[PDB]
Amino acid sequence: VTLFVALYDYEARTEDDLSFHKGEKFQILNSSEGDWWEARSLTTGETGYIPSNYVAPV
């Protein structure tokens, strides 16, 4: 039980980060390896890394 929503949209400038918009759900699997955490979109099914300051516990 640790889902987080994006409070703001974001456009990954690379192919590693992910891209979404305010209101996108995300499942964080690891966030203790840098200010960026690895989240997986439960709508697209793709996983990547996004700004931890852009997500919060829904």
Binding site: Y8, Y10, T14, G34, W36, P51
Partner: peptide
């Protein structure tokens, strides 16, 4: 290291 941590809109960064 410097991360891509984008600036949060709304309150932005002053």
């Amino acid at each position: 290291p410097p991360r891509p941590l984008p600036v949060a809109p709304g309150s932005s960064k002053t």
